[PDB]
A paper describes a structure:
15-hydroxyprostaglandin dehydrogenase (15-PGDH, EC 1.1.1.141) is the key enzyme for the inactivation of prostaglandins, regulating processes such as inflammation or proliferation. 15-PGDH represents the key enzyme in the inactivation of a number of active prostaglandins, leukotrienes and hydroxyeicosatetraenoic acids (HETEs) (e.g., by catalyzing oxidation of PGE2 to 15-keto-prostaglandin E2, (15k-PGE)). Human type-I 15-PGDH is encoded by the HPGD gene and belongs to the evolutionarily conserved superfamily of short-chain dehydrogenase/reductase enzymes (SDRs), within which it is classified as SDR36C1. The enzyme has been purified from human placenta and its primary structure determined by Edman degradation; it was subsequently cloned and characterized as a homodimer with subunits of a size of 29 kDa.
After several unsuccessful crystallization attempts with constructs bearing different tags fused to the N- or C-terminus, respectively, it was possible to grow crystals in presence of NADH from a construct purified with a C-terminal His6 tag and to determine for the first time the structure of the homodimer of 15-PGDH in a complex with its cofactor at a resolution of 1.65 Å. This resolution is not high enough to distinguish the reduced state of the cofactor from its oxidized form. The protein shows the α/β folding pattern that is highly conserved among the short-chain dehydrogenases/reductases (SDR), where a central β-sheet consisting of 8 strands is flanked on either side by two arrays of α-helices (Rossmann fold). In the crystallized construct the last ten amino acids from the 15-PGDH sequence are missing, leaving Tyr256 as the last native amino acid. Instead, the cloning procedure resulted in the fusion of nine non-natural amino acids (Gly-Ser-Lys-Glu-Asn-Leu-Tyr-Phe-Gln) to the C-terminus remaining after cleavage of the tag. The acidic residue Asp36 forms hydrogen bonds to the 2′- and 3′-hydroxyl groups of the adenine ribose moiety, while Asp64 forms a hydrogen bond to the amino group of the adenine moiety.
Author numbering:
A (entry chain A), B (entry chain A): 0 to 265
Write the structure that this text describes.
């Protein structure tokens, strides 16, 4: 197994919710963490609050809209300049908005790809890095349909195909970078609350009760549980292209795509 | 079964390759077809050539970049103004380009969503339409990884999640619109040739032989075979949210997601 202690992590959407859980779990495991978020106030407050549990030198906050490509490039550069290295990238920022759905794709999918590629720019052995791990936040919505969130579902499916593909490319390139995704069920955060608002649901707002019924039936995961999954991916050297599911029913487990790579051609 | 004769189809990327096969198959079945493409010359030549087999009044050509949202809206309006109705939308335009990958997402995914939503704007029973069918071109790359085409793979996975989701939403809304996707193996067109060019493959150009080897092993489908799949979807009233695969091994067949909708939560 890989030891987390002393590694440098860049976590997007780290100011709150699952991102903040990731930052906390990483810090407890001895990592240094660059918290990256577009929410300036929540980001600064998050770092300030973390000073009480962790030495201030363990964290850095950088304000960044992940969908602004020059902003995101500048952010990676500042992180590497500050900590001297990059070992773990977590592309976690995401939103739910079926009304302004183009922006949802830009944040949820386009920015996961752009951040992944910047991670490879720094970490690939062939680019002068020493390898590392990139973890992309998908959802169960990356594997099954969501009638009330078709664009969110598209963005999450996008992450699964991209991640499995980039993981194979990394093997071919001998970049030493492992790429995995996490697909949680419902988690207790601000994204879950957005299903109540026409601002976020648009034409789908009338059907929101179907989601609420699901949440009542299956229950809600605590963000730390998702962080346990992240740590698992980081520590297990054999996981590349893994699609990790996390649910109330089965806890941490994996999508099984079988042992026949070209199944669908056969 | 639904009869194709007399229905009005809008086919994007209709100037060549699979889109043109779709237009030809639809015309033979008695449909009227709006051929939509950004390639002005190939589009005009395509309509001109089709006059030899079909009455000129069966076709309309409209130049349109599907990624330009105002252009695409204007295009739907011109189609409905011309033919008086819209029954079949085929979001088929797509590209392969891992270098300019943001544009690939805009064309392959964003424009499929934008066109789908415009199809629903016209065809939904709740918007004053009478229902219809929307067919989105995915690929086997929508269901399995492609090491040399991770963004193309992301775009195609996006279409599968979006399509299955929008199909469920249509049921909830009683829009009378069926939404399905087609996932072919390799097909003999200009997209297949693009794997040879660094312009289109970027960082993945060195690994192109792995794709070529696959093509040699599994063989190549003729575009008319894909058009047979399209006609099947249009004529079979029971197909909604179907993910149709078309391969040299099995011909036309379907991805089976099983009879347990919430499997992944259980
Ligand atoms: N909460 C759930 O039920 C659930 C389930 C599955 C997957 N997810 C995924 O988990 C990830 C984190 O979401 P969350 O539930 O913690 O939601 P959240 O709203 O609580 O946290 C998201 C964070 O991302 C930040 N962010 C959003 N857009 C950004 C941008 N453009 N640039 C920089 N920062 C941005 C926000 O400011 C916020 O701090 C998302 O990708 C989400 O899709 C959540
Ligand atoms: N050829 C294959 O092996 C294969 C396999 C699976 C899926 N597909 C999918 O089939 C669909 C059609 O591709 P094809 O193989 O016939 O390729 P093609 O290059 O031969 O035809 C694509 C057509 O789309 C048009 N187009 C591209 N971008 C456009 C835009 N922005 N606006 C308007 N028109 C645009 C082109 O001008 C062209 O006429 C694509 O979505 C492709 O991803 C192809």
């Amino acid at each position: 197994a890989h030891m987390v202690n002393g590694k440098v992590a860049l976590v997007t959407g780290a100011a709150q919710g699952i991102g903040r859980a990731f930052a906390e779990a990483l810090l407890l495991k001895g990592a240094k963490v660059a918290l990256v978020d577009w929410n300036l106030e929540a980001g600064v407050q998050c770092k300030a609050a973390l000073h009480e549990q962790f030495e201030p030198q363990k964290t850095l906050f950088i304000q960044c809209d992940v969908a602004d490509q020059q902003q995101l490039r500048d952010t990676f550069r500042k992180v590497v300049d500050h900590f001297g290295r990059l070992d773990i990238l977590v592309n976690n920022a995401g939103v739910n908005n079926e009304k302004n759905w183009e922006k949802t794709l830009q944040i949820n999918l386009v920015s996961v790809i752009s951040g992944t590629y910047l991670g490879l720019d720094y970490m690939s052995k062939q680019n002068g890095g020493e390898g590392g791990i990139i973890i992309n936040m998908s959802s169960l919505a990356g594997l099954m349909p969501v009638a009330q969130q078709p664009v969110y579902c598209a963005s999450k499916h996008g992450i699964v195909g991209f991640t499995r593909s980039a993981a194979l490319a990394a093997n071919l390139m001998n970049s030493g970078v492992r790429l995995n995704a996490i697909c949680p069920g419902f988690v207790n955060t601000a994204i879950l609350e957005s299903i109540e608002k026409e601002e976020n649901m648009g034409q789908y707002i009338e059907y929101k009760d179907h989601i609420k019924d699901m949440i009542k039936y299956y229950g809600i995961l605590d963000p730390p549980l998702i962080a346990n999954g992240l740590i698992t991916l980081i520590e297990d050297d054999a996981l590349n292209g893994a699609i990790m599911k996390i649910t109330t029913s089965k806890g941490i487990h994996f999508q099984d795509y079988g042992s026949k790579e070209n199944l669908y051609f056969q």
